[PDB]
Amino acid sequence: TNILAGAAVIKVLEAWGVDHLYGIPGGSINSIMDALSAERDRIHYIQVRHEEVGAMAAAADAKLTGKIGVCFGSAGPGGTHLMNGLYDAREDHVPVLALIGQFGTTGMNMDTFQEMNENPIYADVADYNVTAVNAATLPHVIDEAIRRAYAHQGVAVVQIPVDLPWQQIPAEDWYASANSYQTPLLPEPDVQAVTRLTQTLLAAERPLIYYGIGARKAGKELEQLSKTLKIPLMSTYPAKGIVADRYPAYLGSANRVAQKPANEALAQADVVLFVGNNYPFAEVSKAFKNTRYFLQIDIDPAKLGKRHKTDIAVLADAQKTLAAILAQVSERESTPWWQANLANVKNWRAYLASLEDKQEGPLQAYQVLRAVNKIAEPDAIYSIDVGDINLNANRHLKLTPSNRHITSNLFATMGVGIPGAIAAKLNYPERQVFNLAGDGGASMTMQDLATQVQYHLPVINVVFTNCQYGWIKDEQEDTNQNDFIGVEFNDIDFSKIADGVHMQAFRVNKIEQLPDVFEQAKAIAQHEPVLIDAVITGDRPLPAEKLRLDSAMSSAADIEAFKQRYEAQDLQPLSTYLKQFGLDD
Amino acid sequence: TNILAGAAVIKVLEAWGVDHLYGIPGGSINSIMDALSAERDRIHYIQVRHEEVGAMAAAADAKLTGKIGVCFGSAGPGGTHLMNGLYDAREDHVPVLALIGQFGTTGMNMDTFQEMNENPIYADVADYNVTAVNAATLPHVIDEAIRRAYAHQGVAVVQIPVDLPWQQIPAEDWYASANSYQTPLLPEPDVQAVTRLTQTLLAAERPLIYYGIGARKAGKELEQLSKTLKIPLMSTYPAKGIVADRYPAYLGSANRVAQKPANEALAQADVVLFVGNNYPFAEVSKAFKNTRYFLQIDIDPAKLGKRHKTDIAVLADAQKTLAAILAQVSERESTPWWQANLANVKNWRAYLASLEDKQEGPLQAYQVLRAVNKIAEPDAIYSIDVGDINLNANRHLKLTPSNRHITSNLFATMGVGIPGAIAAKLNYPERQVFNLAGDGGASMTMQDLATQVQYHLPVINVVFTNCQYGWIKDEQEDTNQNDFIGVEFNDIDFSKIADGVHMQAFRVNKIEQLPDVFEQAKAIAQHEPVLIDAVITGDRPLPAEKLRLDSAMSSAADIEAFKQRYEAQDLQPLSTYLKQFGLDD
Amino acid sequence: TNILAGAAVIKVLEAWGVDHLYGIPGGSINSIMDALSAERDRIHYIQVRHEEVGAMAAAADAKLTGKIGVCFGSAGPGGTHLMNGLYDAREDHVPVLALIGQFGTTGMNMDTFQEMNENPIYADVADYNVTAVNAATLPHVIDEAIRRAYAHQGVAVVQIPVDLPWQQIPAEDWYASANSYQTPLLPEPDVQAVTRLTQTLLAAERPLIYYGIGARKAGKELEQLSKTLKIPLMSTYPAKGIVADRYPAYLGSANRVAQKPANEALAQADVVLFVGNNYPFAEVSKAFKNTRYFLQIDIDPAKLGKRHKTDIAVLADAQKTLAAILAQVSERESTPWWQANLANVKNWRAYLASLEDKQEGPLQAYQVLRAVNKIAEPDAIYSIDVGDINLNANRHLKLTPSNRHITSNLFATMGVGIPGAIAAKLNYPERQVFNLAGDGGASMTMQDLATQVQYHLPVINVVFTNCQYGWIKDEQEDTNQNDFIGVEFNDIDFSKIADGVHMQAFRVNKIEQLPDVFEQAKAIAQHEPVLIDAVITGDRPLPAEKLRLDSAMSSAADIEAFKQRYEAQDLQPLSTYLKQFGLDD
Ligand SMILES: Cc1cc2nc3c(=O)[nH]c(=O)nc-3n(C[C@H](O)[C@H](O)[C@H](O)COP(=O)(O)OP(=O)(O)OC[C@H]3O[C@@H](n4cnc5c(N)ncnc54)[C@H](O)[C@@H]3O)c2cc1C
Ligand SMILES: Cc1cc2nc3c(=O)[nH]c(=O)nc-3n(C[C@H](O)[C@H](O)[C@H](O)COP(=O)(O)OP(=O)(O)OC[C@H]3O[C@@H](n4cnc5c(N)ncnc54)[C@H](O)[C@@H]3O)c2cc1C
Ligand SMILES: Cc1cc2nc3c(=O)[nH]c(=O)nc-3n(C[C@H](O)[C@H](O)[C@H](O)COP(=O)(O)OP(=O)(O)OC[C@H]3O[C@@H](n4cnc5c(N)ncnc54)[C@H](O)[C@@H]3O)c2cc1C
Numbered sequence A, B, C: 001t002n003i004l005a006g007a008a009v010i011k012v013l014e015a016w017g018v019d020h021l022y023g024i025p026g027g028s029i030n031s032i033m034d035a036l037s038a039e040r041d042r043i044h045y046i047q048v049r050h051e052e053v054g055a056m057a058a059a060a061d062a063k064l065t066g067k068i069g070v071c072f073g074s075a076g077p078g079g080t081h082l083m084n085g086l087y088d089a090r091e092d093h094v095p096v097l098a099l100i101g102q103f104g105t106t107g108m109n110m111d112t113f114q115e116m117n118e119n120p121i122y123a124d125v126a127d128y129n130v131t132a133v134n135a136a137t138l139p140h141v142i143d144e145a146i147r148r149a150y151a152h153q154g155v156a157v158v159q160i161p162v163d164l165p166w167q168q169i170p171a172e173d174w175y176a177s178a179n180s181y182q183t184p185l186l187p188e189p190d191v192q193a194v195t196r197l198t199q200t201l202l203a204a205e206r207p208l209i210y211y212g213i214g215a216r217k218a219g220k221e222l223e224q225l226s227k228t229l230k231i232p233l234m235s236t237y238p239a240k241g242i243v244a245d246r247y248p249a250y251l252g253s254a255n256r257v258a259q260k261p262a263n264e265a266l267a268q269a270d271v272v273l274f275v276g277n278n279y280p281f282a283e284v285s286k287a288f289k290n291t292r293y294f295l296q297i298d299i300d301p302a303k304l305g306k307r308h309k310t311d312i313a314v315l316a317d318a319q320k321t322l323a324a325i326l327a328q329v330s331e332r333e334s335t336p337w338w339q340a341n342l343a344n345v346k347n348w349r350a351y352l353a354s355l356e357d358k359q360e361g362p363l364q365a366y367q368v369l370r371a372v373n374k375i376a377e378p379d380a381i382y383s384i385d386v387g388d389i390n391l392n393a394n395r396h397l398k399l400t401p402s403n404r405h406i407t408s409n410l411f412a413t414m415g416v417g418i419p420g421a422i423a424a425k426l427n428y429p430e431r432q433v434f435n436l437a438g439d440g441g442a443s444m445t446m447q448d449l450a451t452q453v454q455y456h457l458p459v460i461n462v463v464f465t466n467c468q469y470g471w472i473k474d475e476q477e478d479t480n481q482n483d484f485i486g487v488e489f490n491d492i493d494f495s496k497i498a499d500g501v502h503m504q505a506f507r508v509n510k511i512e513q514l515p516d517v518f519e520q521a522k523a524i525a526q527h528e529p530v531l532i533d534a535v536i537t538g539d540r541p542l543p544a545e546k547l548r549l550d551s552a553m554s555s556a557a558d559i560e561a562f563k564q565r566y567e568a569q570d571l572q573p574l575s576t577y578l579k580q581f582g583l584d585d
């Protein structure tokens, strides 16, 4: 006849298929806790050591599986600790439900302990942001929050006065709308528009296809289009892996978390097919300043003509549209543009291999990543933190459609490595999971190494210890007039941190130490988490956006300082290859 | 080589096809004013007398045409005046761009005259809410605002420091993305879900199709499904007119702005097909408490199973889906449920006609609306304010697919009658336009009667003068223990108000005065606006949500009282017709 | 034993001595209405025709009396209409309580009719902003709101779900804290800082005392310091009247709502004593660029050295401090700087008088204000709207300590004339009350002329009809490259508007009509409101901030042009008087 409103709320989460959720209890959320406790056989609470890790893990859950992530924080500081993960979810447009503790309705607005108007706190981050005020409508409010978070691909926040979940409500009235759930309709490509797009692309002298994660389901079409038409591919950083990295006409990504051949080719291209792509650097970096024709495919009307004026714009699903192009074209002969890019890619990859293939001496990030490649399973999942590691992982990870990689793409919050790996292992216990993080980012969420131990999540944590915020040091080098500040700091030994949370760990500082340590780590992570603290040099990785290689554009002195610093003696500018095949720069 | 950023902004508006925009100038927006001044041939600025009328008319533009409405307000009080129209646009989910004046960047944050942080003012109402800080990117921010307003069907707000629009920017850099705008090509409704939905609808003993404005393209299919299957039709109030009111099995709308047959039939129905409908009274009124199967068609995933637990929810276009149902069904013979509803509708319409057809005596709202009907062109547009007029217009207006009617559907702001009619006439100069407003609502925006005169917009204004907030008085009668308060007030003579703004006007107070006054008004409104001030009684209109007609549900005393007050002696309850054709309750 | 929570709320208002409050009822606020209905003897509800007039009148209540103003609005559009008055209260830092209707707790967050999260709506405007969620604590939340509004001199907003005020709560639990309210006993101004400030003031060759409304208790000390020390006085515009306008060394105000002698003398001054003053044009106009020493007296630490680098800033009460200065100084003989300023003032006043004293011909604002002066009682209160009238009233009104004048000082919302006068008459039934408004501002709130009639408030409304937003037209003349836009519009006959609301009225357009019309108005306003619609020319009033009179600073051509346009042939620049008495620039 009756049910506790808190029990009904948990039943709503179960109906929506929520397997696990994260947070830290408090008096102000103890009635939700009480309901979770009764339901521990059907829904799985993950106690984190800091609420931001719970929010970040919830966001990563949604990034990985498409299923709404769920986190909670107690009133006041519990909830405000969620912010970095909630902004990550908003900016990476993934569905997250956040429940926030609040004092009972009898105490609200009395200015009692830890009691405040919590609604304005979440107004900016949240697509849906409500304080619940009734027990009987509470399941509906949660159901509504979940449905909107999914539909609008963002954060829903519900502040819950702690009395409400302990109130009895009629057992027969509440329901979940999970049974009615559907994902948004996929628009179809106009046949004439697609034909026009195809003809412009085929007429191009220097075409590129430039895709983002919007083309996630279209890797086959992308690679076959590239092979068939002899058109090089490039991607946003997060879109790495949609087409295998080994594909010889994959240029990489542009800007800074970037590869040399993509930056060079983009500057030369006459026509860009921009697909499922919201590259945030487009305007600020003048990426398309010399592009003659700009062709766009995107499912979101708010994106069409966003990053550049379009010549042809198609409001349709990337894969349906790319298949439609492929179906109306046939094999094209090689072109000078195609060969020039192929040779530039070979040259670039030989550079990266030369860094990876060092066998002894001071450890650099490059060999560490080679060591990851060597122990990586074909379907490994990578949770990557924020900093030099994005750049290094982007260049050195050998990914295929079978892999997943996540980071905080747009909000770019440091600390995401650890929670993303926690979320990865919960959702994919049979898959190998890496947390790749710099020392700065790993420091911010280090306490939740204990969470991997507690729940026996066999993550391979790899910390890149340069005793710097290297990403920022390099920016200060580029822009600041005065000395470096705040970018070089004291050592943390993460093997000792790991020991402290009762996780097996190693610390290495020489290239020659890698094969054996990484083999041990691989074996350990069959059953338990492991940490490798890699003490690396302060070498700056090659800035793809600040190339000094082309004698027509840089002084001989800058060229040689560049080659020496970046061990890039064998790199050729794209212009070398353009000239070989009879094209001018 | 160079162009003023302000001039570029106006070119962005023109590229998106903005015909007219509303506001009041101020020093903080005089640079936008300056650009508008040079572009009078291609964009038409409408100076309103209160900025709320500008915001409300911009919302109405979007309601009528589907094209973005555009308004502006000077810094501080100019912008804050917009609020009621901007919330109207948010709640009625139509695209509106609001430009807000701001002091120049050299004086911002100086606590100077009328200078404040304006961004937090618009955070809640707006889908997109930004302060421009650069002239060169200003055209792009305006373009982004428009593109987001359309994509998210809501309000975009841009605060513009007044220095920026007078700064020169490169002539060749800015662009509009209007050229990329398109509507999606949707797939066909899934065959198997539609088939399943159809079987359940057809298996019902007491089916209803209950549509909202999501089915605005489906009038033809709705009426044919109804006729073919013998299923009565009911709608949300705003969906009145999608199927002609004369259709014998149109029941009307439910709740309070409602018609008796819809409320009665809905209580009896075993299956409801809920199509393109977001009826906000569903849960609070327990509308579907007796429904066995609830079937849904909606284009928005956020709506799926929102209003009631749903047996089958089809994510699809309403018209495509209704056409798909119609293609798989054929004639069913008349049923008792069909005949009972037809007889119930006949009885209700005779009641309404008895009120309209009074020829002499104290004027009531009923005869006023009959007089509107008599002078109405088949494609007239009606701007309806908020109060008893929603209920009366819903019952009395004889609408067809050729009509439009708009009001403030969900935010329900009083005062929308005047601005809605201004916008209707600006968009449709050759169509007859009515403003039907209560005295309370008309007085809120009365100054903008002068805008109709200034711009020669031949609106027919009909003000219903009861010297009451009638809608609220009746509520107070129902709920309040103590005397009426704030709901009976002093007369305003709107014929004299109209005379004050130099608009021709009449004041009437007897039924027999209607024919000639309305004939004169019809004629005047061939060239100039006109106002009829109708002094009506304070009779409470029959409450469709508080029927006292059925012997089984009400005492004889209560029924005789209800029949007396509401001149309802010849009204029969639905149960009478159910019994007549052999059904129980 | 029990009391309705709503009844308790009204008792809280009564305990704090709230005499009258404003709003428009709605279903979402009908339970507060119900409590008000039972308490008509002790609290006076004023039903306005637009909720903005309620908010603005509540702000005016606080401006006039120092006691909290109280208004309300129904859920959604009722509350949002309050905004312009609530921002006025925030910016003019006066206590206002705004009650907002909300749907009952059982329907909140259900997306029902006119139901939204209202809390974020009021976050920016409000010092205190809460949604009540419990009936038993509701009286306390109202008490907290009032107490905070007073303490923080701003707006408190409470959203009240309509069910709560009809719930019974224990009769003995609730209380008001009005009994605890007091004003602080301040220490005396520190002796040594005041002595130091005095020496610097007295050492100056060209001193000015520049006061704002923080010195409203110090009129006597200000005038005596001026007379004794031979130091001219200037004020902020709102501080007009603290020292009688007839005082021969009152220079007026600076900037645009300004008088020539104040602008001229300020440019010349070597020491300024800035007292109880937060002049917002200080920095943007570079008002003190030539000042050698800047001395400050203010009660608010947040103001200390805010507007200019300050040599000595005394944190103290203005009156106590000015009395302390006066106690340590004695007579100084007339100085050249004193005589030059006196002569400059005489010359300016003769100019203003030449405009006022025209006896026949086309009516200008100048003669209208002379006609107001002639019928004004010595303790008249003036509600002034926003536009040219601020400038004209500032120059022409002959005010003394016995007068009050209010406007929207800083938010400067048009429309405040009507509500300010309603509030003035409600607080001071035995004092003569004027509303001086431009046609633009009067038309924004014109419907509430009916409120003056309904409540028998004998306001003298004077509408200045130029068929322009004159203030803005003159700005466009100064800044805009293209034609005037949005600043010249169609006539509204306000005598006919007034007739429409059943208020006696006159329309005048010639100077010779003034005496008899104003005599009739004075008489009518012994018992009933009256309106005079003054059709004035579109002559630009002399710009005190753009003087062209001094041969050393302007060309002969520019001076002759300025003298012609502004009828300023007999005006002399300050430099003439400086030279006359032996000073340079
Ligand atoms: C430290 C750091 C530095 C970074 N710097 C770089 C950098 O230098 N270079 C770089 O490339 N990235 C960089 N980023 C990542 C970057 O900020 C952006 O997140 C990324 O470039 C955007 O990638 P995207 O367009 O693939 O993803 P999103 O921004 O998520 O956009 C996806 C797009 O696809 C559309 N879409 C979705 N589904 C479909 C469909 N079915 N069909 C068609 N369209 C669809 C969406 O509407 C959207 O427009 C960096 C990240 C970090 C952490
Ligand atoms: C004073 C006043 C009183 C009122 N009281 C009543 C009342 O008593 N009774 C009443 O009926 N109304 C009343 N309303 C109006 C009411 O508040 C709601 O706005 C109305 O009932 C909702 O109508 P809707 O569902 O048609 O519109 P919306 O709420 O706009 O819903 C449209 C729905 O259609 C969907 N949709 C849009 N396009 C498509 C498509 N192509 N295919 C499929 N689905 C689509 C949307 O996703 C959405 O779910 C009143 C209004 C006022 C001013
Ligand atoms: C259309 C329009 C144009 C305007 N333009 C002008 C103009 O050109 N010229 C002009 O002068 N005004 C103008 N204003 C008014 C202007 O915006 C400012 O509001 C005004 O100049 C500020 O006056 P104030 O410093 O007296 O008041 P406030 O800003 O209220 O400042 C009061 C100050 O006194 C202090 N204070 C309060 N009590 C005490 C005390 N007991 N002892 C000591 N200090 C105390 C406070 O801390 C504060 O610093 C205009 C207004 C309008 C409507």
Ligand SMILES: Cc1ncc(C[n+]2csc(CCOP(=O)(O)OP(=O)(O)O)c2C)c(N)n1
Pocket (backbone or CB within 6 Å): A385, A386, A387, A388, A389, A412, A413, A414, A437, A438, A439, A440, A441, A442, A464, A466, A468, A469, A470, A471, A472
């Ligand atoms: C929470 C947070 N603080 C600051 C930043 C800015 N930021 C980006 S990268 C970076 C440095 C990362 O340092 P580290 O993790 O040690 O990586 P490294 O570049 O040294 O490999 C900083 C401080 C950020 N993105 N997130």
Ligand SMILES: Cc1ncc(C[n+]2csc(CCOP(=O)(O)OP(=O)(O)O)c2C)c(N)n1
Pocket (backbone or CB within 6 Å): B385, B386, B387, B388, B389, B411, B412, B413, B414, B437, B438, B439, B440, B441, B442, B464, B466, B468, B469, B470, B471, B472, C024, C025, C026, C027, C074, C077, C078, C081
């Ligand atoms: C701005 C605003 N204030 C209050 C309300 C609440 N409200 C709804 S209807 C209504 C009465 C309208 O009175 P009137 O226009 O005279 O219509 P009537 O019912 O008398 O015909 C009110 C006050 C509202 N919707 N909008």
Ligand SMILES: Cc1ncc(C[n+]2csc(CCOP(=O)(O)OP(=O)(O)O)c2C)c(N)n1
Pocket (backbone or CB within 6 Å): B024, B025, B026, B027, B074, B077, B078, B081, C385, C386, C387, C388, C389, C411, C412, C413, C414, C437, C438, C439, C440, C441, C442, C464, C466, C468, C469, C470, C471, C472
């Ligand atoms: C609500 C609002 N809108 C716009 C402004 C900007 N503004 C200041 S004065 C003014 C003109 C006022 O015109 P009017 O009332 O006719 O006075 P006039 O100068 O003609 O005498 C305007 C539009 C404002 N302060 N408030």
Ligand SMILES: [Mg+2]
Pocket (backbone or CB within 6 Å): A438, A439, A440, A464, A465, A466, A467, A468, A469, A470
């Ligand atoms: Mg580091």
Ligand SMILES: [Mg+2]
Pocket (backbone or CB within 6 Å): B387, B438, B439, B440, B464, B465, B466, B467, B468, B469, B470
């Ligand atoms: Mg009325």
Ligand SMILES: [Mg+2]
Pocket (backbone or CB within 6 Å): C387, C438, C439, C440, C464, C465, C466, C467, C468, C469, C470
């Ligand atoms: Mg004017």
Ligand code: NA
Pocket (backbone or CB within 6 Å): B050, B443, B444, B445, B446, B447, C050, C443, C444, C445, C446, C447
């Ligand atoms: Na108004």
